[PDB]
Swiss-Prot record, chains A, B:
Residues 29-96 form the BTB domain. Expressed in spermatids but not in mature spermatozoa. Localizes within the spermatids to a sheath of microtubules around the nucleus and to microtubules within the tail. Homodimerizes via the N-terminal BTB domain. Component of the gypsy chromatin insulator complex, composed of Cp190, mod(mdg4) and su(Hw). The gypsy chromatin insulator complex interacts with Topors via mod(mdg4) and su(Hw). Interacts with Cp60. Interacts with inv. Interacts with Nup98. Interacts (via BTB domain) with pita (via region between the ZAD domain and the first zinc finger domain); the interaction is direct. Interacts with ZIPIC (via region between the ZAD domain and the first zinc finger domain); the interaction is direct. This is Centrosome-associated zinc finger protein Cp190. Plays a central role in chromatin domain organization and boundary function through recruitment by a range of insulator DNA-binding proteins, including ZIPIC, pita, CTCF, su(Hw), cliff and others. Together with pita and CTCF cooperatively binds to and regulates the activity of the Miscadastral pigmentation (MCP) insulator. Cooperatively recruited to the front-ultraabdominal (Fub) boundary by pita, su(Hw) and cliff. Recruitment of Cp190 together with Chro/chromator induces chromatin decondensation. It is found in: Nucleus; Cytoplasm, Cytoskeleton; Cytoplasm, Cytoskeleton, Microtubule organizing center, Centrosome; Chromosome. It comes from Drosophila melanogaster. Coiled coil: none annotated.
Length: 120, 120
């Protein structure tokens, strides 16, 4: 017999919206991003690694304190938060005053998908 | 200033296709499903948990041998493999002879999205 196939459309966005809920409730967040003001951001190591390798570099270079990765000086919540939110939604939420800094941050991470978006 | 927003369309499928590549290369696979013939299936614990809680129940009930979860008798590769592939793609690939068993398995997991698909 021949193998048949049926699908469920809009599964990508549906699956993505599920991971956003987990990110909102800090469910199964293995990676803890810790900023300069001791504020934390619980994320999924899989979601970030699927969008860039920059966070994988930080884990081998930056210091770790009690399961919390210390973010470098140029990589704080002003740029990290809206970029991570983009990974979970596909939407970049930002103020116009943050444009240049987000662009330079995107170049630093070499996040191509975010580079093209900012350079429309 | 007002917060602005730009987006990248088809991000859901794009992000989903990234996780499929990781699943193909066994990259960052934390959960190891071990079948009766000692065959293994490397999966992501996040992807499965986002589609059902059934695998979370197996981790608290079924035995674990060297980071490998022992699958129950009714839950083997004949049904597990095509169902997991659905989670990563949104497409259920199967033979017609497996229809009834996949349906009963879906009822057992209470995977609603797969139930409606099979009961079109």
């Amino acid at each position: 017999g021949e193998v048949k196939s049926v699908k469920v459309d809009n599964w990508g966005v549906f699956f993505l919206q599920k991971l956003q809920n987990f990110f909102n409730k800090t469910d199964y967040c293995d990676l803890t991003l810790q900023f300069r003001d001791n504020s934390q951001l619980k994320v999924h190591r899989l979601v970030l690694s699927a969008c860039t390798d920059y966070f994988n570099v930080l884990e081998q270079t930056c210091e770790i304190v009690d399961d919390a990765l210390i973010m470098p000086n140029e990589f704080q919540a002003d740029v990290v938060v809206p970029i991570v939110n983009f990974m979970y939604t596909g939407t970049l939420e930002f103020e116009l005053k943050m444009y240049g800094k987000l662009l330079r941050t995107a170049k630093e991470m070499n996040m191509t998908v975010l580079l093209k978006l900012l350079e429309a």
